[PDB]
Amino acid sequence: VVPFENLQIEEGIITDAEVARFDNIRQGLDFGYGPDPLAFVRWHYDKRKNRIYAIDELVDHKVSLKRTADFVRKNKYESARIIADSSEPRSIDALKLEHGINRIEGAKKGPDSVEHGERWLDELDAIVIDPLRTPNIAREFENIDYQTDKNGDPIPRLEDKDNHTIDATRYAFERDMK
């Protein structure tokens, strides 16, 4: 009925000292399309505790690959891999060959992996988000609901709306699932 009961959301819940230690980084990127924003996410993965921690994000409705690469470079996030929305193969090429983001690769998983990937996220012990650091991730994860059928009952598919950072997060963790 309610997804992501596992959410741990509170201002200040991730300290500067913690961000300093996190060293199992996962990054995802959705390019946006039509009015939908580009959404870059960076997380830390504690595999033993089955937790993920949101570190940073960039959400931009006025999509600029230049601005995205500048943000990634500025924060020295270039050294960790970015798994990106594979529907824009030339945007990936652009970030690599034009903007020097070398560790970007297309998401290997296809459109039929969506429900699986969302379920994987929902089955984590905790998804830990500090709205002071990642306000968009916080808002989207808190407010996302299940889709529903004729009979008006929830199906195990999240709404495909206001979910741009959730998509980016799926890509970021695609290699960690099963």
Swiss-Prot record:
<feature type="binding site">
    <location>
        <position position="30"/>
    </location>
    <ligand>
        <name>Mn(2+) 1</name>
    </ligand>
</feature>
<comment type="subunit">
    <text>Monomer. Interacts with the terminase small subunit; the active complex is probably composed of two decameric ring-shaped terminase small subunit and two monomeric terminase large subunit. Interacts with the portal protein.</text>
</comment>
<feature type="binding site">
    <location>
        <position position="164"/>
    </location>
    <ligand>
        <name>Mn(2+) 2</name>
    </ligand>
</feature>
<feature type="binding site">
    <location>
        <position position="85"/>
    </location>
    <ligand>
        <name>Mn(2+) 1</name>
    </ligand>
</feature>
<comment type="function">
    <text>The terminase large subunit acts as an ATP driven molecular motor necessary for viral DNA translocation into empty capsids and as an endonuclease that cuts the viral genome to initiate and to end a packaging reaction. The terminase lies at a unique vertex of the procapsid and is composed of two subunits, a small terminase subunit involved in viral DNA recognition (packaging sequence), and a large terminase subunit possessing endonucleolytic and ATPase activities. Both terminase subunits heterooligomerize and are docked on the portal protein to form the packaging machine.</text>
</comment>
<protein>
    <recommendedName>
        <fullName>Terminase, large subunit</fullName>
    </recommendedName>
</protein>
<feature type="region of interest" description="Nuclease activity and binding to the portal protein">
    <location>
        <begin position="1"/>
        <end position="178"/>
    </location>
</feature>
<feature type="binding site">
    <location>
        <position position="167"/>
    </location>
    <ligand>
        <name>Mn(2+) 2</name>
    </ligand>
</feature>
<feature type="binding site">
    <location>
        <position position="30"/>
    </location>
    <ligand>
        <name>Mn(2+) 2</name>
    </ligand>
</feature>
